[PDB]
Amino acid sequence: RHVRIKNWGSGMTFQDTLHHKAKGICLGSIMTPKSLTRGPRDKPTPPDELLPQAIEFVNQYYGSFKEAKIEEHLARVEAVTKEIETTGTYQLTGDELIFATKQAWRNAPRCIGRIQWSNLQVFDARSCSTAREMFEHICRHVRYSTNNGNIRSAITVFPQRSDGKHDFRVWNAQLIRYAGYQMPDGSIRGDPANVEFTQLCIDLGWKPKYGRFDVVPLVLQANGRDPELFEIPPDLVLEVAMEHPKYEWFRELELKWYALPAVANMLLEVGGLEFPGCPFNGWYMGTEIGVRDFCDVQRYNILEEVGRRMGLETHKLASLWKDQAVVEINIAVLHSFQKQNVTIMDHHSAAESFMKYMQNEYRSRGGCPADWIWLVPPMSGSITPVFHQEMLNYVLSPFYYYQVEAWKTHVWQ
Amino acid sequence: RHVRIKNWGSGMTFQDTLHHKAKGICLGSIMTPKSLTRGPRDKPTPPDELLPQAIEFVNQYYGSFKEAKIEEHLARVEAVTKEIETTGTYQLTGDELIFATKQAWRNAPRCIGRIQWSNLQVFDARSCSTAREMFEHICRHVRYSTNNGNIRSAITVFPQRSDGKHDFRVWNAQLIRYAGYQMPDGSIRGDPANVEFTQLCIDLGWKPKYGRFDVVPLVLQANGRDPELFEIPPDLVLEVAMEHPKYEWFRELELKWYALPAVANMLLEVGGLEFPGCPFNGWYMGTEIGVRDFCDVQRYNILEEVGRRMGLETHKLASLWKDQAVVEINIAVLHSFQKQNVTIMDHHSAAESFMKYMQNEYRSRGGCPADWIWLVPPMSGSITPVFHQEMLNYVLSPFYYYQVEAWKTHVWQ
Amino acid sequence: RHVRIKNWGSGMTFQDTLHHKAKGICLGSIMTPKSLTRGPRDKPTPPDELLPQAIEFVNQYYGSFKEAKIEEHLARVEAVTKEIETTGTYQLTGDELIFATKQAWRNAPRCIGRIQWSNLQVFDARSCSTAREMFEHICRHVRYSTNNGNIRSAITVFPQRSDGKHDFRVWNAQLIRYAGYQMPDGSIRGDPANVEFTQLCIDLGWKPKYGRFDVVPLVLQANGRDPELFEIPPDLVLEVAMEHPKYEWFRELELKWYALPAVANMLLEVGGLEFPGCPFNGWYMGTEIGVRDFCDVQRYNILEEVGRRMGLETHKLASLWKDQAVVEINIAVLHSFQKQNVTIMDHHSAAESFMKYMQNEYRSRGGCPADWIWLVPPMSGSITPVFHQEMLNYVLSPFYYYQVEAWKTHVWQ
Amino acid sequence: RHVRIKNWGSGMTFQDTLHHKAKGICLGSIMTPKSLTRGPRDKPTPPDELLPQAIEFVNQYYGSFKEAKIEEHLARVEAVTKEIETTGTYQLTGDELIFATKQAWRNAPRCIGRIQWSNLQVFDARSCSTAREMFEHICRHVRYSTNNGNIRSAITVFPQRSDGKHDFRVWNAQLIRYAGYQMPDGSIRGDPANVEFTQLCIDLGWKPKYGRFDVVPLVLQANGRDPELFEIPPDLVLEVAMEHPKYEWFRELELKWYALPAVANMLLEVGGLEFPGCPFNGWYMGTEIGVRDFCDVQRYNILEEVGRRMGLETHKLASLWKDQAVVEINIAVLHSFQKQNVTIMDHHSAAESFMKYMQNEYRSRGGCPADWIWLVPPMSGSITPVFHQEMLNYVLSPFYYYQVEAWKTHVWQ
Ligand code: HEM
Numbered sequence A, B, C, D: 001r002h003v004r005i006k007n008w009g010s011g012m013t014f015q016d017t018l019h020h021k022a023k024g025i026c027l028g029s030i031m032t033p034k035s036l037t038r039g040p041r042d043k044p045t046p047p048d049e050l051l052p053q054a055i056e057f058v059n060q061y062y063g064s065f066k067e068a069k070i071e072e073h074l075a076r077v078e079a080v081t082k083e084i085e086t087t088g089t090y091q092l093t094g095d096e097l098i099f100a101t102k103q104a105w106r107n108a109p110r111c112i113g114r115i116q117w118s119n120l121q122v123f124d125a126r127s128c129s130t131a132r133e134m135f136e137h138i139c140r141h142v143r144y145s146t147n148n149g150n151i152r153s154a155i156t157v158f159p160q161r162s163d164g165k166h167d168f169r170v171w172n173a174q175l176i177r178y179a180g181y182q183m184p185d186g187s188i189r190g191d192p193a194n195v196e197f198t199q200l201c202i203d204l205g206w207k208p209k210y211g212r213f214d215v216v217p218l219v220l221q222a223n224g225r226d227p228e229l230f231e232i233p234p235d236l237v238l239e240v241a242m243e244h245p246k247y248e249w250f251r252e253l254e255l256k257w258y259a260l261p262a263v264a265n266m267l268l269e270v271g272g273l274e275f276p277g278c279p280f281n282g283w284y285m286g287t288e289i290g291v292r293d294f295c296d297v298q299r300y301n302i303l304e305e306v307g308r309r310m311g312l313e314t315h316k317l318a319s320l321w322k323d324q325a326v327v328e329i330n331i332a333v334l335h336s337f338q339k340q341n342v343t344i345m346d347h348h349s350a351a352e353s354f355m356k357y358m359q360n361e362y363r364s365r366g367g368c369p370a371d372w373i374w375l376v377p378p379m380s381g382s383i384t385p386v387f388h389q390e391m392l393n394y395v396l397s398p399f400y401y402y403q404v405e406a407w408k409t410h411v412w413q
């Protein structure tokens, strides 16, 4: 049974059926609902409970293939059953893992970038062992993805959970993020969103360097142990200085940003197994840096200042000065990234492509999970076509769930 | 059960309890869910189930007063219970109404303009009997709200619902909307969302004027009977012609819009009762006209034209040429409404005043129902505090529901 | 002894030999130098001193012909001597007259229109005797030249002056002009520059209408007699109402002007004869009305008002507000004229057309008399080629001279 | 004898007597006429042709002081007479020079700045001895007058002409001026009026830089010797980059202009002495950059382009596009110089003051020598009072004369 949804802009309608295949988990605009969280545990998933899911994942994987693969399918099911019954858990083939990481992306309902899903570099780092080693893998990763400014998407997978006590985790939210500091006059220099995390880093040893853009160290957690700190060697963090193609004074704001956006603190779910260490990256969309990173009040908040030097009437709020200023900032980001041969995509182009993605999804697998709230751009929203797209939002499997900030639960062994 | 609600903008965090007294009706971004609709009926609501709700609301009414008048309260509940007795339904004092309209405004979650909820003008018209009287009651409503420039808000309540066979309802979307016509060569002229309806109007005998800004006539329904067209007198329609502070050429586009946004076809629910005609108006928000009306591909869609006219790089999408037009078009709208002294609200001031309201509502009733998707303005979203506010969405009584539009069910006499 | 003459704009460089013929009469920018006036006299030009000037002209006339008839040159030269000896004066042949009016035009150093000179209607009114009769020829001239808006150049020539005591003249500076009146409160209303003359008319019987554009009557003198008033029928007075093509409000200044510019008060000198009655007209140049008639402080003086009305910064001198208004008014004039199918020439075309003329003159007769001060338009001067053209000013024969205005010398019967 | 002259705008007339004192020298609109030029010579000015002129000046000087200085005056008259009897020439006191330069400024009849005359830095450089020494002096002068943007007027005076074989002159017509080059395909780059000169320096060994705004070298001539080239230190050449305050695109024209207008190539006459080296500067009038430098066909010629940039009907003349652009360019010039904090006066302000200057001169020496052709701005002429003022032109003494340009008449060592 089918659910009707309409693109009010084109009149085109899809019939969504893939929903009636969803894990059945209005908590309305909540950023991190419980429904999308996967907490810690501390005994391994009951093996009885894991079995049906593993058959289901094996079944998904095999029915992904061009011709039927009967022989090897039946083989794999038996194989997997025995493995769980005898060992409590199971291991997945090198391929299975590729397929899952790609599928879980495809299933991520907040990612506008999804047209790229079939195209994802998969770093199998499951046999990883000290934080020493986690750090090395993460560099192998950043080097590949930064690709001399021609960003590519890639994922690095650290060994499954077992226990719920021997977790491999990156504690940082993103691989590369700017520090933020509470200054003695009560003011915040740096990135206010990160005041808390940086404190943690300082507490754990890091020398606080008191600057607008200091890159915070990796906080790496091997086998559930206490975390250890590593600094990403600077020449692997690729950055872009902001300038504006018309306004000189832009350069004087002395603004820059990193090229590579990588989520680190999220957990991957596959046929019942959980990986709490999987950092993945794509490339940036204009507005993320422009609108958010630079104009959000709780991030860099450069909006007021720019209005002032565009000489706008920053006091009559009705003059739309704020909107003008946003747009200039956003041109500046794109322009800088282009003037520099560093991959980046504007929100219009993104949305356009997402519409094509959404189209083939319905055409090919009967559906497409999507968070409208997340997918419609932080700026000039109803000008993009996704704005007028009725969309359904649901949890499939494989899937990327958020977990609980690691420090919130860790026991300092 | 108290539910946590954060404003990632400031940090300020609300507790929410009000959700609990919501007779609890992911249908994600669906424009009109069945959840939010009030269908047609052919019998009157059963004695049995109409009484509990009748009581419910009288309760609300009284425990909202100066203090608490104890036996108007038992003598009003005496009244109602014995009123359902002898004709199985009931009346509301010329005054329980003033309350429930103001209350159901307070309760409509998509309205960003709810700081003004107590400042409403109630036009009692529940006695009214030809459609041609409906017409006059509406023109009172209009001349009043238009107020020669300075807009005030008003609702007009028509007779409730007996058999359902005898409904009083306006078929229009809003009172003032522009007609849309499908031209000989297949092209469209006017407001293209309204083609549909303009068509219907013509079939009911309206002479089409084949013009971009023609005001479509009222289609009116006297208790059940077929509908009759009455055109509004042209000088009860206040309109603003568009021009730009900086762009003399903007006039050349010859664009204008109406002063007054009113909603004809929603149904009010009050402690059990249903009123299928209750038009209500407020004043316009900048974007509704600037962004939405003018820029939407399925509306006037002038964006391409304005960018040619500002000579931007209208072929390189990533030049943000779209985002600039949209700003400039909106300054035009905002500026034109000041130049001709007509109440208008830019989307910032709206947002801010909403945030103040939302704060009040959580302070004084422990909850504020809000549909994030509708409240965040259609341009420059994240530059308005509401974007960063987590919100809960729920239906209370009294409430304004959408109906299936008359022409689709109404049995043709 | 040719004089070098450089056009700094082009670099092109003429050699003037025609100044050698100048009757050799720094009076820098004086509007009416003594040497361009022909005063009254009160005895005929002495037979003696006239004779050579008559021959003079005669050779110049015949030496003008393509052909060259020697025996007619002699026949004419003979007729003339034998005419001057016996009458004391001579008579021009009809044809000689055409030639002479045309030549004096060519010889008018202040007239940018000269490209047109070979092409000019000549009305012979030398046999005229009553003032009423003068008035008839004049309306013939006006209907002819007005030509339903397609203006044509023409001159009407009244009886030569005989003894200086029997002059036929028009006292009016121009055939069509608006009255200026001195109001009781100090202020002036109408054409301030014309208060003076208006007064005289009132004095001779005319009823003042106290209106901004009131057409003054004709003040006509027939051989010596006190002048008489006739009003040109409103039908022969073609006018144009100013509107601007972007500013509706322009029409609110209720401005108009007349289509026909005719100098009436000047004196033609041919071969020692003086005709002090000879009005001639051409078509208007934009700027004459736009810059001069409307913006001269001592004329209609509308400039400040057009300023306020356009919204410019009219107390900051440096804002160039004075210069923007003058451009817009000047457009209104051209626009208005086009709009009503009435010949008008803008000052740019005029400039260029003069340059083509000047150059032909240098080619064909070795010189071209030219008053730089009068020829360079009253706005955007250096933008016209005549500005960078070095010129010589000098008096040839025939020639149009200024006269001492009649009322200043006339003795009244 | 008195000479009456009218201001047609104001009605006001002066009578002029100062002209009787003019050393008695139509040479019509000639830029650089014989009568205002001052020959080279090869003998000293014969002593007793000098004498009457020396007494004359000495008389003027003492006559300038508020209270008769009888003794000191007589002393100086004999002083001088002796000096001439015995040396065949004379020196003038440091003070007399200060007085002369100012008087001669007052007497230069083409300078609308003259309102300032009483107010001039006078660099005595009469002791000067080499071309290098000349260069030294000229910098003192530029750093002084440039005065950090706040322009001040100054004159530097090099040693009087002796036998006029040992002249001291700067061959450059102005101090700072841009080179103009004739490019290989005959197009002209830079300042086309300046081509032939720039070629001269190229030939005296300047390395041509082939840009738009190349500052030319100084061509210096000491003691009649051949000249030598010096380049002004670039940081003494203050320039203004041009931007319109409404049109961003203006900045894209990439125009700038120097801040200091200094005339070198003129000769000072005082009491029969000739100074062939006296460079003077004042500050700019808007128009001479905006209208002339930027719009003359023979200059930077931008008009066509700005027209295109502005959407104007550059193909239909009568649209007055040309007039509209010349305005905006001019605004840009003033606005640029104002924002960059550099003295400039606009042509209305200029003219309004000349008018006060004139009116004082009449009040107080019975005259004011004025070239109307040069005084009336190259734009909106009629809109400035001077257009309407009849003015007399004549040569007093002291006086700044023009010279045969040095390269025409230099005996090449
Ligand atoms: C072609 C490259 C990609 C682009 C252009 C892109 C674009 C985006 C953007 C703009 C967001 C929202 C970011 C924000 O709100 O702060 C997002 C969210 C997300 N994307 Fe992507 N994406 C890309 C690749 C990926 C990849 C490779 C994965 C993992 C396989 C992924 C999974 C997600 C997830 C899980 C979110 C949720 C955001 C959160 O709460 O942190 N995306 N994507």
Ligand code: HEM
Residues within 6 Å of the ligand: B101, B104, B105, B108, B110, B111, B112, B113, B114, B116, B120, B153, B154, B155, B263, B280, B281, B282, B283, B284, B285, B288, B345, B374, B400
């Ligand atoms: C005080 C003036 C008012 C302002 C400024 C205002 C503002 C707005 C805005 C901007 C919208 C969204 C428009 C759209 O998306 O098409 C809206 C929708 C709405 N408002 Fe208001 N409002 C006002 C008065 C009222 C009143 C008097 C009522 C009823 C008593 C009301 C109930 C609603 C409802 C139910 C909607 C949803 C409309 C729909 O789905 O068609 N508002 N309001």
Ligand code: HEM
Residues within 6 Å of the ligand: C101, C104, C105, C108, C110, C111, C112, C113, C114, C116, C120, C153, C154, C155, C263, C280, C281, C282, C283, C284, C285, C288, C345, C374, C400
């Ligand atoms: C094609 C038609 C003509 C045009 C466009 C034209 C243009 C002009 C203009 C623009 C002026 C200056 C007006 C002012 O500043 O007051 C002028 C002055 C003059 N033109 Fe013409 N002209 C035309 C025909 C004639 C004719 C037919 C004659 C006589 C044969 C003539 C002789 C003069 C004279 C004598 C002046 C100086 C008049 C004065 O001081 O009032 N022009 N002309």
Ligand code: HEM
Residues within 6 Å of the ligand: D101, D105, D108, D110, D111, D112, D113, D114, D116, D120, D153, D154, D155, D263, D280, D281, D282, D283, D284, D285, D288, D345, D374, D400
């Ligand atoms: C307040 C300062 C001054 C201003 C604003 C000013 C303004 C002007 C202007 C606009 C011109 C016409 C320039 C042109 O068409 O190229 C001019 C010409 C002239 N001014 Fe000045 N002036 C100033 C000071 C001086 C000084 C200090 C002198 C010499 C002492 C001077 C002597 C002249 C001379 C001789 C000319 C004739 C220009 C030529 O053909 O080279 N002015 N002045």
Ligand SMILES: Cc1cc(N)nc(CCc2cncc([C@H](CN)Cc3cc(C)cc(N)n3)c2)c1
Residues within 6 Å of the ligand: A031, A032, A113, A174, A261, A262, A263, A280, A281, A282, A283, A284, A285, A288, A402
């Ligand atoms: C794969 C990828 C691609 C891309 N273009 N951008 C990204 C952005 C990742 C990111 C960076 N900085 C902040 C965020 C989000 C806030 N916008 C993370 C977040 C924060 C919070 C408080 C809740 C939540 N659910 N998610 C996400 C990831």
Ligand SMILES: Cc1cc(N)nc(CCc2cncc([C@H](CN)Cc3cc(C)cc(N)n3)c2)c1
Residues within 6 Å of the ligand: B031, B032, B113, B174, B261, B262, B263, B280, B281, B282, B283, B284, B285, B288, B402
């Ligand atoms: C009371 C009031 C105030 C105000 N400022 N603006 C308005 C706008 C009313 C309006 C005008 N034009 C179109 C609409 C709605 C779209 N936003 C119509 C609509 C269409 C559909 C398919 C669903 C829906 N729920 N509503 C609403 C109403």
Ligand SMILES: Cc1cc(N)nc(CCc2cncc([C@H](CN)Cc3cc(C)cc(N)n3)c2)c1
Residues within 6 Å of the ligand: C031, C032, C174, C261, C262, C263, C280, C281, C282, C283, C284, C285, C288
């Ligand atoms: C034949 C012709 C053509 C044309 N296009 N314009 C005209 C303008 C005639 C005109 C109209 N209004 C005033 C004037 C002149 C000043 N502009 C009159 C005049 C006045 C004074 C005080 C002195 C003088 N020499 N000339 C002339 C004539």
Ligand SMILES: Cc1cc(N)nc(CCc2cncc([C@H](CN)Cc3cc(C)cc(N)n3)c2)c1
Residues within 6 Å of the ligand: D031, D032, D174, D261, D262, D263, D280, D281, D282, D283, D284, D285, D288, D402
């Ligand atoms: C002291 C001073 C002040 C000021 N505001 N402007 C100036 C003008 C400097 C200047 C710059 N470029 C050209 C000129 C003159 C053109 N108006 C040059 C010139 C050329 C010719 C051929 C003749 C002539 N007499 N004068 C002058 C000087």
Ligand SMILES: C[C@H](O)[C@H](O)[C@H]1CNc2nc(N)[nH]c(=O)c2N1
Residues within 6 Å of the ligand: A008, A387, A388, A389, A390, A391, B029, B030, B031, B373, B374, B375, B376
């Ligand atoms: C499909 C999607 O829900 C639809 O385009 C909605 C989105 N948000 C909106 N928000 C407001 N305020 N008004 C609207 O019409 C819409 N349209």
Ligand SMILES: C[C@H](O)[C@H](O)[C@H]1CNc2nc(N)[nH]c(=O)c2N1
Residues within 6 Å of the ligand: A029, A030, A031, A373, A374, A375, B008, B387, B388, B389, B390, B391
């Ligand atoms: C309250 C609300 O959920 C929150 O501010 C969200 C809204 N939508 C978003 N959408 C994206 N893509 N990224 C964000 O950070 C947010 N913030």
Ligand SMILES: C[C@H](O)[C@H](O)[C@H]1CNc2nc(N)[nH]c(=O)c2N1
Residues within 6 Å of the ligand: C029, C030, C031, C373, C374, C375, D008, D387, D388, D389, D390, D391
């Ligand atoms: C004083 C000066 O001669 C007078 O204002 C002149 C200037 N130049 C002119 N030039 C033309 N063509 N017409 C005029 O009236 C004038 N007026």
Ligand SMILES: C[C@H](O)[C@H](O)[C@H]1CNc2nc(N)[nH]c(=O)c2N1
Residues within 6 Å of the ligand: C008, C387, C388, C389, C390, C391, D029, D030, D031, D373, D374, D375
């Ligand atoms: C030919 C004419 O004299 C030449 O183009 C003059 C005109 N008037 C001028 N007036 C000023 N002030 N400066 C100039 O260069 C000129 N040029």
